[PDB]
Amino acid sequence: VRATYTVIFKNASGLPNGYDNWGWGCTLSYYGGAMIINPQEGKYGAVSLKRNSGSFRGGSLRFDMKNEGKVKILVENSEADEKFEVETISPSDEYVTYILDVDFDLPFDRIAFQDAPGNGDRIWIKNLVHSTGSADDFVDPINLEHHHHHH
């Protein structure tokens, strides 16, 4: 019952180690540790972070995000040709941390962030982690590693 946390990236200066991007309709740039998604207008651009090898199953996704528009979070199984909408996130000027249960009943090898309104709103992502356990049971190894010196 020990949860496995998989840190996908903290600060990004490029595509996460062991991942490719199998989305469309965006350009990517990296500054301030953020993966900066620039969707093109009219494309509903997505970044689909594709594991080179293996799959996650269930549990929960943790990440920081700011975004000028609504963002659709998905997981996908490449082999089964199956997508699952995890959540749609409202616009925010400031980074907000989300921890979201993945209720998909299949393994997933892809985690996607999509420009839902398709108007080209930018999206900024940092600190992407997967846990095998639930959102309520998530003990963030990222925030824990900031305050370890104190308590």
Interface with Na ion by CB under 5 A: which residues?
Answer: 38, 120
Tokens of 144: 């824990």
**Which lies closer to Na ion via its Cβ, residue 109 or residue 115?**
115
- If the CB atoms of residues 76 and 121 are measured against Na ion, the closer one turns out to be 121
Using DSSP's 3-state secondary structure scheme, residue 142 falls into helix
Tell me which amino acid residue 13 is: S
Q: How far is CA 28 from each of CA 14, 36, 46, 47, 56, rounded to the nearest angstrom?
A: 9, 6, 11, 9, 24
Helix (H, G, I), strand (E, B) or coil at 144: helix
Closest CA to 125 of 6, 4, 9, 7: 9
Three-class SS state of 141: helix
Chain residue at closest Cβ approach to Na ion: 120
Q: Which of 58/120 has CB closer to Na ion?
A: 120
Taking the C-alpha atoms of residue 123 and residue 38, their distance in angstroms, rounded to an integer, is: 7
Q: Closest CB to Na ion among 4 and 27?
A: 27
